[PDB]
From a paper:
Ribosomes are macromolecular ribonucleoprotein (RNP) assemblies that function together with transfer RNA (tRNA) in translating messenger RNA (mRNA) into protein. The LSU rRNA of Euglena differs from the typical rRNA in eukaryotes as it is uniquely fragmented into 14 segments. In summary, the Euglena cytoribosome is an unusual RNP, which is distinct from other ribosomes in that it harbours four unique core ribosomal proteins, while its LSU rRNA is highly fragmented. The RNAs in this ribosome species (particularly the LSU rRNA) are also substantially enriched in post-transcriptional modifications, which are spread far beyond the catalytic RNA core, likely contributing to the stabilization of rRNA fragments.
To unravel the architecture of the [name] ribosome we purified intact 80S ribosomes and assembled in vitro a ternary complex with mRNA and tRNAs. Multibody refinement followed by particle polishing resulted in an improved density map with an overall resolution of 3 Å for the entire particle, and 3.0, 3.02 and 3.13 Å for the LSU, SSU-body and SSU-head, respectively. The final map allowed us to build, refine and validate the complete model of the Euglena ribosome, including all sixteen rRNA components (18S, 5.8S, 5S and the thirteen segments comprising the 28S rRNA), three tRNAs, an mRNA and a total of 34 RPs for the SSU and 41 for the LSU. Notable structural changes are most prominent in the SSU, which exceeds the size of a typical 40S particle and bears extended RNA segments in the body region, as well as harboring an additional RP (termed here eSEug1). For the LSU, all of the rRNA segments were readily visible, indicating that although the rRNA in this ribosome is highly fragmented, the RNA segments interact extensively to form the universally conserved ribosome backbone. Notable differences were observed in the protein composition of the LSU, and include the absence of RP eL28 and the presence of three Euglena-specific proteins, denoted here as eLEgr1, eLEgr2 and eLEgr3. The cryo-EM structure reveals that, as in kinetoplastids, the Euglena LSU shares a similar fold with other eukaryotic ribosomes, and although the number of LSU rRNA segments in this ribosome species is doubled compared to kinetoplastids, its RNA chain termini also face the solvent-exposed region, clustering in focal points that largely overlap those observed in trypanosomatids. The [name] ribosome is decorated with a total of 349 rRNA modifications, the highest number of ribosomal modifications reported to date. Our cryo-EM analysis enabled the direct visualization of 186 Nm residues in the Euglena ribosome, revealing their 3D context. A notable feature of this ribosome is a cluster of five m1A residues localized to a distinctive LSU rRNA expansion segment on the ribosomal surface and adjacent to the protein exit tunnel.
Numbering used by the authors:
A (entry chain Sb): 2 to 98
B (entry chain ST): 2 to 20, 22 to 150
C (entry chain SJ): 2 to 130
D (entry chain L3): 2 to 34
E (entry chain SP): 2 to 72
F (entry chain SV): 2 to 126
G (entry chain Sc): 2 to 85
H (entry chain SY): 1 to 82
RNA sequence: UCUGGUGCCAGCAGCUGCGGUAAUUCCAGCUCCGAGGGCGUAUACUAACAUUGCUGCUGUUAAAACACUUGUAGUCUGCCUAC
RNA sequence: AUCCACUGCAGCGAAGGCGUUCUGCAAGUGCACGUCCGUCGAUCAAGAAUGAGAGUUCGGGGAGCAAAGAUGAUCAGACACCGUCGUAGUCCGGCCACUGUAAACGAUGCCGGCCAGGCCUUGGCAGAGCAAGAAUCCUAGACUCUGUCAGGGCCAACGAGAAAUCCACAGCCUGUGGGUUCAGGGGGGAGUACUGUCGCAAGGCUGAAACUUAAAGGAAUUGACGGAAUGGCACCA
RNA sequence: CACCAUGUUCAA
């Protein structure tokens, strides 16, 4: 009952992979087993972009600064905060978004 | 490179089919004289062959004078006391020991030293069997330094 | 590492026949290998074969004709008397009618039927059917 | 879940109970000898 | 795998001999502790004196009382 | 919801394919047409079939409804598809602009024969 | 493009040019020798294609080929011609 | 096969793949049999043909097309470029 | 075509093939089709020699003409480019054909309405007609396919190097094939160009 | 009563095909047991046996559904044998459909000689092995007076296939009757599969029935 | 799928199981089956058993690849030398 | 103390393991080659050298985190999860400190031969290209294509398998033999007892039996369930 | 992401 051909991780030709810490839980998870997402947001969402750009001087729409986060998750917190969802046995082989 | 590693490489040279290319008017006495000239200068057989292959157009000394390089060295009294395989392995072990004796906590120089000394003994066994080395011969770390 | 060139040759030939190849390359060649191949030819399980000179353990190209089912080597080369011939037949061959055991005997590398008819035993060397 | 049916308690914890038992035994035999 | 090769007779025989000890039937037959420990010291029948009667509750799913005697 | 059943749809389809020349886009005359065409045991079923047929006829009027075969129009489409132009488009094309043939395709036509043939454009990539 | 199943005994030139110097049907050399001359002189040195160390003139001692990882790199202007 | 009298005891001697030499068994529903027509000099087809049986093993290994190529080269049908 | 010169291609035929682009492959290659590709263009397309294309075309013609009772031949094409071609091919040879979607189990399900038990079947594209090839395997019928340079010729017995993805390429190939099949049997002559155009085989949209 | 569906059905209904080897020679699918009932009549030239009727259960909510797999062997003792495994909800229909499937799956069993070729073939021509699941079943050629030395399932299959002598070596979970009978059936199948010097010579292809009766087959449409 | 008694009791039963008031299995009666001047029981060993595997086992997950290299004894070792 | 992002179906190392920059020291693999030797090799009981983390020893260090402990909640209990602290420990050095175990895993011994196709990637070597800053010159370690050797993977035939699955192997296996080492023989008792040996200790290695039991177990299926996910729904919500 | 422990024996 090996569930994954790569046993939940992308470690190949390695022996040891650095252990990183989950973003919220704080769990030590291998760097390749972790579900990692580099997310880019804005300091301001469109619920406030007009209200701030109307009072800004050096900014406007399409100009506000961004947030670059790189959230790394353990499998538990990924599945709970629904970053990832359980997939079918046949749809587990899908590796592109 | 398969003996003491996971290496599976095959990069070795490959002779022709001929066994002289109809050029190289140079003949046996000349090539042997060249061999002995650059053997007097301390150059070992493997380097003799390369210095005679690169710029002199003499590949496969054997083909010009059927005696291989070590044969023509022994036939002129210029062959070393210990074969160059052993000699270079001894020198490598000497350097590794010299290193780790001060880098006392390498723990990988130690492993590679175990390997190179195992090779040294596996080859010294063969040479003692073939009588190229004296029957009493033995590789000691403490005295190998005074051979290079 | 590289035991029994004959074993490697026979396994290559059997794998080629199994894959359906019409000619197989074998590397290197030996006297034992050539005599085994000639014993196969004599009964027609093997087409022509020719040796290409490497100057380094010459190689062989055998032409296969679909009549082979299996070539194998029996290692170690057990000794075989004439009473043991029937034991080896009933254990190795698929039938008592066709298929052959190759034996190295004091009379050269020999078929098992030829060995039985000219009254000699020897060391087993393989089989083909 | 990650494993199939230990037919007792967790093998790590019964291994640990065995180790504690073993050194209690060791102390009782060191009493005598 | 096992050693083929025409001079591995000692290896093969010693391995078979040291490995036969994992057959529990052979092991109990050859290990001289059953003649010692078993009450029938290698014997079909023995004679004894009835010491007491015993009612033994049958194992699940059965619920009888088997009548035995301590001998 | 008012999703129809196949006992209505598959009857609408054959009624259309057999009587497209008689029906209209009017429900209450398609009703009187079907009440003489079909033997429907129920008037509610008659009216469901009639309404679905009027819907399909309205879609016919609108545009190409995918799923019916009006023969007296599909024979027309078939015979126009089977109409022959006097000159094959490929013939007049090789007359007008020859044929664009690349470097290695000229190399292949030279490898075989047909190398020095007419109407080539000698194009390269 | 042949329609023919190339037998191993007579292999095509295209495929046999690609093969490793060992995995050919007959193992052969993957090198050659060169007659080489520098404009600074006339002596025709005979060098190896894949030189292992530096090669200089017999008299001028000006480097002709300089060793690299693979084939030799002949110096600026040194004319060369492959030998049979 | 016969029985020492020259009397064929084997019913249904099967047919063999023409590329390999392997027997086509009684359940090889992937095997095929052909008829490549023969043609006179004037381009017409006389009712003559060369027959070719292929085995399901070949037709799975995908060497059936190249086997046909080889067989027609042997039978002087496919024209080599030259 | 080996001994027969009258079956060799004509200059006009090669011109109208190069026109319909049947000499062009795709950026992908199969090692079983590597034998029919002459070379590559520096944009990647594999040009495949109309010589071998014509050899395999006249070979398929030989098989199709040796097959008497042409109603035992089924042309198959699933993609839109090719259905008009197979319809015309059936019309002019006597063969049978199928619609866009091959009903799975025709060549296996005996109690099926669309049984279609042929003696041979001619397939436009293997990658698209993967089904009929499988049922061929299950039913012992040979397969003659128009194999592009990107085509699994697993159960294909007679592959023909083609394009399979050009609406005029398919029409051209089926026109050539039916022309050869009608030249054989003594129905069509050689010198006289036969009256049916190639424009009838190409794919025309409904409107 | 039996309106033939396939070309083989029509040919055997109209006596264009003579007997089974005419279909075996081209390996054509049968798909209709009426063909083999035409060539081997029901009572006499074909005996059928029911080896086992095993219930299998699919669990459902509110109960569990039980259905019987019937294993039926079909054969006359001259070299033909077939194996049909068919589920059904009732034992009657299971057995009937299994007889039909076994009749469709009837195959020819090559028979050979162990030693001298004196009379008629009596044993398997070669050592054969059949696989299904873990059950490997080896059929070994036995001499004239050895008899069938199999165990029940292979014994009756070999009896039906009409071999007089055979040694066997079953290796798997032989108590699984399904696989244990499929293995020996597969072995009897490989019997003709193995190639011998007897079959070394030329092929000499023939017209298949479809080509040979193309004119007849093009009328019933 | 016999008849009476018993009613998870008595008991049977190598294993699976039978016995809880309609027991095809207990206690009996009748009947029937098997070996038969014999049959049962217990114990030991053999075969079954390719479940000790030389022929001839298995080792990803069922029992079982040493953490990993080295390395002695042991085992095994490339091509060639007469018409 | 630790070296984010870069950081990956990337590389290296016998494995454990290895990530800031400059630098000292020795080393390895691969590749290239008409260099040398000339069988010197494969696997290996005993033996030897490395061996995560925990643990121990001697001397320092102590930010952060944290067994034990303290302590506030939660709870029926809660010296549990949760929260606040907190000691050993984690960090450094040592006769070359000791130990010598891990789901030390690819749960897959090592050497050798053969094994369809397609795709990605690492390092060379070879041959080409429309292929690169400042400029426009000029070359350039960049990029593209092809071949090949070595490495790391992915998906796809035959075959194998109980299946899951394997696929440069878990294929070539009842059509069974290339060579070699280790281990297993129903489940427990038990990796226990005794003994031996190593260690400061913890403990490692070695390692039974009496007795007990008919199943343990593996893969897969159908249903049921879920304080699992998704999507529909009901005033018996 | 408060807390949500349990269900006598054989039989089906
Ligand atoms: Zn988390």
């Amino acid at each position: 009952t090996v569930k994954r051909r790569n046993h939940g991780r992308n470690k190949k030709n390695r022996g040891h992979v650095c252990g990183i810490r989950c973003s919220n839980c704080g769990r030590m998870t291998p760097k390749d087993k972790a579900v990692k997402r580099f997310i880019v947001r804005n300091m301001v969402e469109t619920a406030a972009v007009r209200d701030i750009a109307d009072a800004s001087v050096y900014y406007t729409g399409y100009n506000l600064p961004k947030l670059y986060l790189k959230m790394q998750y353990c499998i538990s917190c990924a599945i709970h905060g629904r970053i990832v969802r359980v997939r079918s046995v046949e749809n587990r082989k899908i590796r592109s978004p | 490179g398969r003996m003491h590693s996971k290496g599976k490489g095959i990069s070795n040279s490959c002779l022709p089919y001929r066994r002289a290319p109809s050029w190289l008017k140079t003949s046996s006495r000349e090539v042997v004289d060249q061999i002995c000239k650059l053997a007097k200068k301390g150059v070992p057989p493997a380097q003799i062959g390369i210095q005679l292959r690169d710029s002199h157009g003499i590949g496969s000394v054997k083909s010009i004078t059927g005696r291989k390089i070590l044969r023509v060295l022994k036939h002129n009294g210029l062959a070393p006391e210990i074969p160059e395989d052993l000699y270079h392995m001894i020198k490598k072990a000497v350097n590794v020991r010299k290193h780790l004796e001060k880098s006392r906590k390498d723990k990988d120089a130690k492993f590679r030293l175990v390997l190179v000394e195992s090779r040294i003994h596996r080859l010294a066994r063969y040479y003692k069997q073939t009588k190229q080395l004296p029957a009493t011969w033995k590789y000691e770390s403490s005295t190998a330094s005074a051979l290079v | 590492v590289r035991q029994s060139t004959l074993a490697d040759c026979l396994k290559c030939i059997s794998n080629a026949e199994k894959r359906g190849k019409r000619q197989v390359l074998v590397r290197p060649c030996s006297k034992t290998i050539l005599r085994f191949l000639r014993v196969m030819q004599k009964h027609g399980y093997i087409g022509d074969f020719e040796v290409v000179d490497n100057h380094r353990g010459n190689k062989i190209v055998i032409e296969l004709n679909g009549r082979l089912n299996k070539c194998g080597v029996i290692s170690p080369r057990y000794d075989i008397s004439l009473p043991q011939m029937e034991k080896w037949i009933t254990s190795l061959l698929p039938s008592r009618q066709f298929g052959f055991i190759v034996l190295t005997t004091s009379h050269g590398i020999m078929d098992h039927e030829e060995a039985r008819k000219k009254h000699t035993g020897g060391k087993i060397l393989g089989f083909f059917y | 879940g990650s494993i199939s049916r230990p037919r007792g308690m967790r093998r790590k914890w019964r291994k640990k109970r065995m180790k504690r038992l073993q050194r209690r035994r060791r102390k009782m035999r060191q009493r005598s000898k | 795998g096992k050693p083929h090769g025409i001079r591995t007779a000692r290896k093969l025989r010693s391995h078979r001999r040291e490995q036969r000890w994992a057959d529990k039937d052979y092991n109990k037959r050859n290990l001289g502790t059953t003649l010692k420990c078993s009450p029938f010291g290698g014997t079909s029948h023995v004679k004894g004196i009835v010491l007491e009667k015993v009612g033994v509750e049958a194992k699940q799913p059965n619920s009888a009382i088997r009548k035995c005697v301590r001998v | 919801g008012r999703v129809r059943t196949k006992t209505v749809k598959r009857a609408s389809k054959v009624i259309i394919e057999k009587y497209f020349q008689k029906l209209t886009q009017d429900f209450q005359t398609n009703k009187k047409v079907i009440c003489e065409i079909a033997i429907v045991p129920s008037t509610r079923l008659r009216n469901k079939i009639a309404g679905f047929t009027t819907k399909l006829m309205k879609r016919i009027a609108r545009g190409p409804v995918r799923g019916i075969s009006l023969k007296l129009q599909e024979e027309e489409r078939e015979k126009r598809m089977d109409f022959a132009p006097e000159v094959s488009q490929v013939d007049q094309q090789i007359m007008d602009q020859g044929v664009e043939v690349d470097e290695d395709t000229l190399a292949m036509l030279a490898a075989m024969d047909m190398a020095n043939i007419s109407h080539l454009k000698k194009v390269q990539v | 493009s042949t329609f023919k199943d190339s037998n191993l005994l007579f292999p095509p030139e295209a495929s046999e040019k690609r093969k490793h110097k060992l995995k050919r049907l007959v193992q052969g050399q993957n090198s050659f020798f060169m007659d080489v001359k520098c404009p600074s002189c006339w002596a025709i040195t005979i060098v190896f294609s894949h030189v292992a160390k530096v090669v200089v003139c017999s008299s001028c001692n000006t480097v002709l080929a300089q060793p690299t990882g693979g084939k030799a790199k002949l110096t600026e202007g040194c004319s060369f011609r492959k030998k049979p | 096969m016969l029985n020492d009298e020259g009397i064929n005891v084997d019913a249904y001697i099967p047919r063999k793949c023409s590329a390999t030499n392997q027997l086509i068994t009684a359940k090889d529903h992937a095997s095929v049999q052909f008829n490549v027509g023969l043609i006179d000099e004037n381009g017409a087809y006389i009712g003559e043909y060369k027959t070719i049986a292929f085995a399901g093993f070949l037709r799975r290994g995908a060497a059936s097309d190249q086997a046909l190529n080889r067989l027609m080269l042997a039978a002087n049908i496919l024209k080599e470029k030259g | 075509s080996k001994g027969r010169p009258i079956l060799d291609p004509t200059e006009d035929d090669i011109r109208k093939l190069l026109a319909c682009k049947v000499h062009l492959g795709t950026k992908n290659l199969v090692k079983q089709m590597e034998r029919y590709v002459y070379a590559r263009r520096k944009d990647g397309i594999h040009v495949l020699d109309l010589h071998m294309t014509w050899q395999k075309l006249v070979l398929a013609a030989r098989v199709l003409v040796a097959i008497e009772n042409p109603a035992d031949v089924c042309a198959i094409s699933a993609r839109p480019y090719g259905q008009r071609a197979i319809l015309k091919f059936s019309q002019y040879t006597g063969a049978q054909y199928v619609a866009s979607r091959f009903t799975p189990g025709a060549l296996t399900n005996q109690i099926q309405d669309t049984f279609m038990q042929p003696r041979i079947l001619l397939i436009t594209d293997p990658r698209t007609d993967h089904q009929a090839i499988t049922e061929s395997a299950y039913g012992n019928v040979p397969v003659i396919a128009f194999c592009d340079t990107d085509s699994p010729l697993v159960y294909v017995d007679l592959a023909i190097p083609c394009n399979n993805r050009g609406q005029k390429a398919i029409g051209m190939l089926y026109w050539m094939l039916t022309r050869e099949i009608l030249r054989m049997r003594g129905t069509c002559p050689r010198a006289v160009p036969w009256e049916i155009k190639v424009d009838l085989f190409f794919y025309r949209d409904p409107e | 009563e039996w309106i033939p569906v396939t070309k083989l059905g029509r040919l055997v209904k109209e006596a264009k095909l003579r007997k089974l080897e005419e279909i075996y020679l081209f390996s054509l699918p049968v798909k209709e047991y009426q063909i083999v009932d035409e060539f081997l009549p029901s009572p006499g030239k074909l005996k059928d046996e029911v080896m086992k009727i095993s219930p299998v259960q699919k669990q459902t909510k509110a109960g569990q559904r039980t259905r019987f797999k019937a294993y039926v062997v079909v054969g006359d003792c001259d070299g033909h044998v077939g194996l049909g495994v068919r589920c059904s909800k009732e034992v009657a229909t299971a057995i009937r459909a299994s007889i039909q499937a076994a009749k469709v799956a009837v195959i020819p069993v090559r028979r050979g000689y162990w030693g001298n070729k004196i009379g008629l073939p009596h044993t398997v021509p070669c050592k054969v092995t059949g696989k299904c699941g873990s059950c490997r079943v080896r059929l070994v050629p036995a001499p004239r007076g050895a008899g069938i030395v199999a165990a029940g399932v292979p014994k009756k299959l070999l009896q039906f296939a009409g071999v007089e002598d055979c040694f066997t070596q079953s290796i798997g979970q032989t108590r699984t009757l399904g696989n244990f009978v499929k293995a020996t059936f597969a072995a009897l199948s490989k019997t003709y599969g193995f190639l011998t010097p007897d079959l070394w010579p030329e092929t000499h292809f023939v017209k298949d029935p479809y080509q040979e009766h193309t004119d007849f087959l093009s009328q019933g449409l």
